[PDB]
């Protein structure tokens, strides 16, 4: 003969007063089971007493932590006050339905007049609670804000990550996708380079005929204006662009003097320098990401950054998918990711495998084991030079 | 569903009072015909599975205006026998099924509470407030209305029960904390009007716990100062004003709200020769707050709002008003 029951939920927690509660003899029966199943026969069973939502994600999260321990927070206790009639059981007591044995015992400790009943014992309140979680969305819709799917979703993510310390040592997604970006933008830099190269050489081909380093080509076209307004060392530009006094600027001037190409329209030159400025900005962003990946690779996998170098080590980890994947890979798998060269290849595969498992399984990584193994590969290079 | 038979029950409930109204000359055959037809259509759409508390309120106001019109026609017809009790009870049944159906419409909750508070169902209103407050533990509006009608009736202990439970539950917004300090000091003013309570340490204590409350904001403490500054005609009002000022001066030293309360502090019970002297003292405080190193735009917005309020207070000197205009324009 039960009166109330609590219920724990990802959106909150509630209590319900059962009116015309369930048979205790009649529990294996088909008809009682189908009556439990159908909502249309269960709302007459259970009435809502009261409901309590979470305030914040950390609040419900700590609630999960507490209830997994078995201990409770004072605000659920406040709900117990807020819905329980005050007494001790000197003449009368009150029956509460609780799932977990620790939880029920602690509530009975906290309140003398309550017999809490853990479902682990009680098939009765277990069956009640299973009807609860059966219709747990359709006894709430009028008062439930939003939904429960996304709630369970985010809450479980956070609980998993709290118990496992997830974000404090997962970074390889940023690592490998930064690598993917750098390769993509680098090839795009190459395409922009060749395109604006031939594209300006239509107006002036001596710039190709003398000038390599297409980023410097882009700098000198954004600084060049047109073919006629040239001087060597005008203001703050060619001195740090290149050699300025005696080597390059005079040759550029005499190339523009011997120049032969088509004179360009002004809005076309504006287009040209828009393109070149784009090229320079993305090359600058490449160097920013290069420094950034060196820093992040130093932060997350120092041993690999010293044994291979950051670009190639990051190539390998991106082709792997994750540092955990790299650790999972065996040695010949690392080969897949004369005879002396293949022998060295196997050897370095072994060593980077070990450095990988080290970096994947240190909490805050170090550098020194990568350093000593770098010395091992250095003396192995010496050993194979001795031949 | 089973709406035909459930509505059969409810219309059979509605029958005998209408029989009384037909043996009376108060309503004729066609009128009562129209009435029963309307009530049937109403109760049907009420007990429809797909349902909404707006249409619930529609039926609510419909039966309420029925009781009203029948009372008016009865008074015009000088009849005394017929009462309103069955109409009240069927209105209550409409509400009861409404609240069992939707546990989620706070507006309909307040509608039920207003109807009860108007028709004098005292203990019933208390118990319904109890239920709905258990149902929605996250509306300071509900908590404040509970404790406020309790403070209005005079059960200050039950007012303290409702308000203290609300403070125990709601902890994200300081609004019910504001209103609780409001009703506590209002009860203290009621004591001083009927003239521990001589100390009046309860707003001090609720500020002490508010100091470590989760919503602990400097602007929240400023609003605490504002509600304390309301009704400054008391005994320990200077005491609590000094206490909150020294508390926020100890905690938020360079806050523009701390400078605003340092400006508007000695105007507790002002409205008379004591007005312009304290005005000049607070103006010296205001000039000091202006020259001090704080967020000058924030402090100036605070002071221009409070000075627009001051301009809304009439009965002042034109020189004072114009120098407020100048000090307002110079921000």
């Amino acid at each position: 003969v039960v009166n109330f029951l609590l219920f724990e939920s990802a959106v909150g927690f509630s209590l319900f007063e059962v009116v015309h509660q369930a048979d205790t003899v009649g529990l294996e029966l088909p008809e009682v089971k189908d009556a439990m199943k159908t909502l249309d026969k269960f709302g007459k069973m259970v009435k809502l007493r009261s409901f309590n939502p979470w305030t914040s994600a950390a609040q419900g999260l700590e609630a999960i932590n507490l209830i997994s321990e078995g201990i409770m927070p004072e605000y659920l206790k406040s709900a117990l006050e807020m819905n329980l009639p005050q007494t001790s059981g000197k003449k009368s007591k009150v029956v509460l339905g609780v799932a977990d044995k620790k939880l029920a015992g602690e509530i009975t400790a906290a309140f003398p007049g309550v017999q809490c009943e853990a479902a682990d014992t009680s098939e009765v309140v277990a069956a009640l609670l299973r009807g609860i979680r059966t219709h747990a969305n359709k006894l709430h819709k009028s008062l439930q804000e939003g939904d429960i799917g996304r709630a369970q979703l985010g809450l479980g993510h956070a609980y998993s990550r709290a118990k496992v310390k997830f974000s404090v040592h997962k970074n390889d997604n940023h690592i490998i996708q930064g690598i993917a970006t750098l390769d993509a933008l680098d090839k795009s830099i190459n395409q922009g380079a060749m395109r604006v190269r031939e594209w300006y050489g239509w107006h002036f081909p001596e710039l190709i005929r003398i000038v390599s380093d297409n980023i410097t080509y882009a700098k000198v076209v954004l600084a060049i204006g047109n073919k006629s307004s040239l001087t060597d060392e005008s203001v703050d530009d060619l001195a740090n662009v290149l050699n300025q006094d005696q080597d390059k600027a005079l040759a550029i001037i005499q190339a523009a003097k011997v120049s032969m190409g088509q004179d360009i329209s002004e809005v076309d030159l504006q287009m040209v320098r828009d393109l070149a400025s784009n090229v320079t900005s993305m090359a600058d962003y490449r160097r920013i990401l290069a420094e950034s990946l060196d820093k992040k690779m130093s932060e997350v996998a120092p041993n690999l950054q010293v044994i291979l170098g950051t670009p190639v080590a990051a190539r390998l980890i991106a082709h792997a998918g994750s540092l955990t994947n790299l650790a999972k890979y065996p040695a010949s798998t690392l080969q897949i990711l004369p005879k002396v060269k293949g022998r060295i290849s196997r050897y370095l595969a072994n060593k980077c495998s070990i450095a990988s498992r080290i970096d994947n399984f240190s909490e805050k990584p170090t550098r020194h084991f990568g350093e000593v193994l770098r010395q091992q590969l250095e003396q192995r290079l010496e050993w194979y030079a001795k031949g | 569903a089973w709406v035909a038979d459930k509505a059969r029950f409810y219309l059979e409930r509605a029958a005998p009072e209408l029989r009384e109204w037909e043996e009376k000359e108060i309503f004729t055959k066609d009128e009562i015909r129209n009435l029963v037809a309307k009530r049937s259509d109403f109760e049907h759409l009420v007990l429809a599975p797909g349902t909404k508390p707006t249409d619930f309120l529609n039926y609510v106001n419909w039966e309420r205006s029925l009781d009203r019109l029948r009372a008016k026609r009865c008074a015009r017809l000088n009849i005394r026998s017929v009462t309103s009790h069955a109409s009240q009870a069927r209105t209550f049944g409409i509400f009861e099924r409404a609240v069992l159906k939707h546990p989620g419409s706070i507006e309909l909750w307040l509608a039920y509470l207003e109807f009860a508070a108007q028709v004098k169902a005292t203990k019933r209103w208390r118990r319904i407030m109890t239920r709905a407050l258990r149902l929605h533990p996250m509306n300071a509006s509900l908590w404040t209305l509970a404790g406020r009608r309790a403070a209005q009736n005079g059960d200050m202990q039950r007012a303290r029960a409702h308000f203290l439970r609300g403070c125990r539950f709601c902890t994200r917004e300081p609004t019910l904390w504001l209103e609780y300090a409001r009703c506590e000091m209002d009860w203290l003013a009621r004591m001083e009007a009927k003239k521990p309570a001589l100390s009046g340490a309860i707003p001090i204590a609720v500020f002490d716990v508010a100091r470590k409350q989760p919503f602990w904001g400097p602007a929240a403490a400023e609003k605490f100062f504002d509600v304390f500054a309301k009704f400054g005609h008391l005994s320990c009002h200077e005491r609590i004003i000094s206490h909150v000022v020294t508390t926020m001066q100890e905690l938020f030293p360079n806050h523009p709200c701390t400078w605003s309360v340092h400006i508007r502090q000695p105007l507790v019970g002002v409205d008379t020769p004591a007005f312009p002297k304290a005005l000049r003292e607070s103006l010296a405080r205001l000039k000091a707050a202006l020259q001090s190193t704080t967020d000058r735009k924030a402090l100036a917005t605070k002071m221009v709002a409070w000075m627009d309020g001051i301009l809304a207070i009439e009965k002042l000197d034109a020189a004072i008003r114009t120098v407020l205009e100048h000090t307002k324009r110079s921000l």
């Binding site: - | 039950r158 303290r160 203290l164 439970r165 125990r168």
Partner: peptide, 28 residues
């Protein structure tokens, strides 16, 4: 009776705030 809210006492004292106000009212 779970139909109403009977007023609070040190048995159903919840927090430090309730403890302080109940101390004040017991002093009263």
């Amino acid at each position: 009776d779970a139909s109403e809210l009977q007023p609070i006492t040190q048995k159903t004292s919840g927090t430090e705030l309730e403890q302080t106000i109940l101390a004040i009212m017991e002093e009263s």
